[PDB]
Amino acid sequence: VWKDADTTLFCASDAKAHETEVHNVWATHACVPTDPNPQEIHLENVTENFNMWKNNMVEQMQEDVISLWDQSLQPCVKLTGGSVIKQACPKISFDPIPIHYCTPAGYVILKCNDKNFNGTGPCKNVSSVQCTHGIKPVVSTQLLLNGSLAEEEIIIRSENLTNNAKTIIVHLNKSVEINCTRPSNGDIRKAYCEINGTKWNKVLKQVTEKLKEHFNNKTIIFQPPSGGDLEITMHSFNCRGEFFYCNTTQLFNNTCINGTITLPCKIKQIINMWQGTGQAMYAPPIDGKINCVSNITGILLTRDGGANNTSNETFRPGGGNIKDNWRSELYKYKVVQIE
Ligand SMILES: O=C(NC[C@H]1NCCc2ccccc21)C(=O)Nc1ccc(Cl)c(F)c1
Ligand SMILES: *[C@@H]1O[C@H](CO)[C@@H](O)[C@H](O)[C@H]1NC(C)=O
Ligand SMILES: *[C@@H]1O[C@H](CO)[C@@H](O)[C@H](O)[C@H]1NC(C)=O
Ligand SMILES: *[C@@H]1O[C@H](CO)[C@@H](O)[C@H](O)[C@H]1NC(C)=O
Ligand SMILES: *[C@@H]1O[C@H](CO)[C@@H](O)[C@H](O)[C@H]1NC(C)=O
Ligand SMILES: *[C@@H]1O[C@H](CO)[C@@H](O)[C@H](O)[C@H]1NC(C)=O
Ligand SMILES: *[C@@H]1O[C@H](CO)[C@@H](O)[C@H](O)[C@H]1NC(C)=O
Ligand SMILES: *[C@@H]1O[C@H](CO)[C@@H](O)[C@H](O)[C@H]1NC(C)=O
Ligand SMILES: *[C@@H]1O[C@H](CO)[C@@H](O)[C@H](O)[C@H]1NC(C)=O
Ligand SMILES: *[C@@H]1O[C@H](CO)[C@@H](O)[C@H](O)[C@H]1NC(C)=O
Ligand SMILES: *[C@@H]1O[C@H](CO)[C@@H](O)[C@H](O)[C@H]1NC(C)=O
Ligand SMILES: *[C@@H]1O[C@H](CO)[C@@H](O)[C@H](O)[C@H]1NC(C)=O
């Protein structure tokens, strides 16, 4: 017997104790070795209710990631509660590694194995495990990168689709590589991302179709963000310690629904910290080719309001709350207390 409960989880990884990479260094001092031959008990005739949108596991991982950044990612100047904090801002080795989240004694992690589980409600196929799968603390907006792919069909996730204020998480079932590089040799901040239009449009089309299922076959329209912080209006992400801001206008136009889509990007030193604690300035980009090939595994969308009296539903690429990023990977997990 067991009950839904919250407890201080611990982490496990395969970090190398000799790596200068921030993630490795952190996990080396904050995590333990992974279990080479882990156990998993499949519960037959068991029905458990999940709720990705209200899961303490998310908050905890958020706290870890924040800690990892507070230790190995301090900017030159930090702007917070009216205070100005200045400190060294040396270049570092940056490349996220898988992080497993585990439960201590007396607790276990229930895992939903339903093919098309949307993150909320009852789960038919439930199993018990000590740790989750390896999850990369990849911070980004608009597009989810290097995540996990859905098993069968594309999955739409939301605490409440009827509410436009609630973020939407599109879980892709097929990856779409995005090639981002900052050429060695002008403007040391000019960058770009290449994407196979054929693949992207094919996926985006499938996304629209699935969205129709949840919106009564209403016409699905994509549009670029109305306004706000650059981190939201643009696909922001971190590549090798450098912050990339990419214009995804070409990615979200309802025309191609063929060639290589080239997105205009720029490395920003001044940024609005995702921790939501003001602004911060980092050092200039390093020299040489700055390349990062990532898998687009999910999309963060925001639905426009005031469309109830129209046959259209407008979706725009959003983001900001990194917690949603962790949800897109922890949706199938929940902690329970064993008697
Ligand atoms: O300032 C941010 N959100 C603040 C705020 N924005 C509006 C929406 C929102 C929602 C919840 C919490 C904060 C916010 C932010 O997300 N920054 C950021 C920086 C670097 C990368 Cl790589 C990145 F992906 C994001
Ligand atoms: C997820 O499944 C539950 C249970 O069937 C359902 O109530 C809810 O509407 C679904 N959520 C989405 C986003 O479709
Ligand atoms: C999930 O359960 C259904 C029956 O409810 C079963 O048909 C299906 O094979 C299961 N999915 C998995 C884990 O393969
Ligand atoms: C990139 O996508 C491919 C194809 O799905 C996958 O095999 C590979 O593991 C992905 N790389 C990641 C997630 O880092
Ligand atoms: C992805 O999911 C969609 C349904 O959302 C499905 O039609 C399609 O066959 C899936 N693609 C793959 C590669 O399985
Ligand atoms: C979902 O959101 C809609 C729109 O705000 C709201 O009317 C409704 O009460 C919400 N449903 C739930 C389950 O809270
Ligand atoms: C990524 O794009 C760059 C620039 O076009 C190219 O040189 C490189 O070969 C690409 N990488 C992959 C994995 O295709
Ligand atoms: C683009 O994607 C298609 C499949 O959608 C593939 O057949 C083709 O080889 C890709 N083009 C390039 C430039 O790799
Ligand atoms: C969308 O249209 C199809 C084909 O007519 C129909 O089978 C399905 O019920 C509709 N889906 C809705 C209205 O959610
Ligand atoms: C984003 O970039 C596109 C071109 O890729 C441009 O047309 C558009 O004006 C830009 N949006 C803004 C206002 O940043
Ligand atoms: C839509 O995206 C395609 C990608 O090839 C681009 O060529 C086209 O200019 C875009 N249309 C717009 C921005 O209206
Ligand atoms: C995505 O994964 C690839 C392969 O490990 C890595 O090279 C790249 O840096 C990752 N992208 C991001 C933004 O973390």
Numbering used by the authors: 44 to 124, 198 to 301, 324 to 355, 357 to 396, 411 to 492
Task: Share the article's original sentences.
The HIV-1 viral spike is composed of three copies of the gp120 envelope glycoprotein attached non-covalently to three copies of the gp41 transmembrane molecule. Binding of the primary cell surface receptor, CD4, to the gp120 component of the viral spike exposes and/or induces the formation of a site for co-receptor binding (either CCR5 or CXCR4). The NBD chemotype consists of three essential regions: Region I, a para-substituted aromatic ring; Region II, an oxalamide linker; and Region III, a tetramethylpiperidine heterocyclic ring system. Herein, we present the high-resolution structures of NBD-557 in complex with clades BYU2 and in complex with clade A/E93TH057 gp120 core, as well the structures of four Region III NBD-congeners, AS-II-37, AS-I-261, MAE-II-167, and MAE-II-188, in complex with the clade A/E93TH057 gp120 coree.
We used this gp120 coree H375S variant and co-crystallized with NBD-557 or racemic mixtures of (±)-AS-II-37, (±)-AS-I-261, (±)-MAE-II-167, or (±)-MAE-II-188. The parental NBD compounds possessed a para-halogen substituent on the aromatic ring of Region I, whereas the latter four NBD analogues possessed a para-chloro, meta-fluoro substituted aromatic ring. The structures of these four analogues (AS-II-37, AS-I-261, MAE-II-167, and MAE-II-188) in complex with clade A/E93TH057 gp120 coree (H375S) revealed that the Region I and II moieties within the Phe 43 cavity exhibit nearly identical poses to NBD-557. In Region I, the meta-fluoro substitution on the aromatic ring of AS-II-37, AS-I-261, MAE-II-167, and MAE-II-188 visually increased shape complementarity between Region I by filling the gp120 Phe 43 cavity near residues Val 255 and Ser 375. Electron densities of the Region III moieties were, however, not as well defined as those of Regions I and II. The poor electron density of the Region III tetrahydroisoquinoline of AS-II-37 led us to model AS-II-37 in three conformations: one for the (R)-enantiomer and two for the (S)-enantiomer. We selected a conformation of the (S)-enantiomer in which the tetrahydroisoquinoline nitrogen was positioned to make a weak electrostatic interaction (4.3 Å) with Asp 368 of gp120. Congeners (±)-AS-II-37, (±)-AS-I-261, (±)-MAE-II-167, and (±)-MAE-II-188, which displaying similar affinities for full-length gp120, equally enhanced monomeric coremin and full-length gp120 binding to 17b. These enhancements of 17b binding were comparable to those observed with NBD-557 and DMJ-I-228, except for with (±)-AS-II-37, which exerted somewhat reduced enhancement for coremin binding to 17b. In particular, the binding modes of (S)-AS-II-37, (S,S)-AS-I-261, (S,S)-MAE-II-167 to gp120 suggest that the Region III moiety can be further modified to improve the interactions with Asp 368gp120 in Area A.
